[PDB]
């Protein structure tokens, strides 16, 4: 399950993540509500 609105909480949170990744990287996942750090993980391509 992936929705237009969830591809809304996602890309704003990928503006919060870096090209040399400055994080344990769930700094995207806490903003997704919903689907997991798991379900978030694969979804970056």
């Amino acid at each position: 399950p992936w929705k237009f609105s969830e591809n809304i909480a996602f890309e704003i949170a990928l503006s919060f993540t870096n090209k040399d990744t400055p994080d344990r990287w769930k700094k995207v996942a806490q903003y997704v509500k919903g689907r997991t750090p798991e379900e978030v993980k694969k979804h970056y391509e």
Partner: protein
Amino acid sequence: GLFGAIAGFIEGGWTGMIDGWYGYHHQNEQGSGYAADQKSTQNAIDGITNKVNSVIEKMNTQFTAVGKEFNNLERRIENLNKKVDDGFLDIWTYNAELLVLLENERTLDFHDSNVRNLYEKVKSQLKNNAKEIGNGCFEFYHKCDDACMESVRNGTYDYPKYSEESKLNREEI
């Protein structure tokens, strides 16, 4: 501005906080930098996507709509047919355009409220301890480490602890 806290008494934001929508620039003995607020940011996101979700949830997708054929003696019902088609388009074009102009302005000063809202969640956590020079700035009378400073951002505290440190600093200048 609406709530006054963007393009505001704070006339600019900070390029260098990449971590979220809102946060705190703090400076002290140790050193300076940005730390985002992951509370009011996750509040605003989940609220805003939910706004974006809601308009589209009020959109059933289009299902199959194809043109109709009429002969040369059916002109009137053909024009009737055109009229219904144009009419429904004019309305949906209106509703879509207008709504986006409307809700954008309501989104902009949604954020303007949320900066103002966090500013006073601090000022009300501060009281005696500091001064307001404006532009977001609360200058601490009493000394603060990072930890004490992570404590305003935490919201956790106790107020009198740094009180006596602060109070006699207010006088001689």
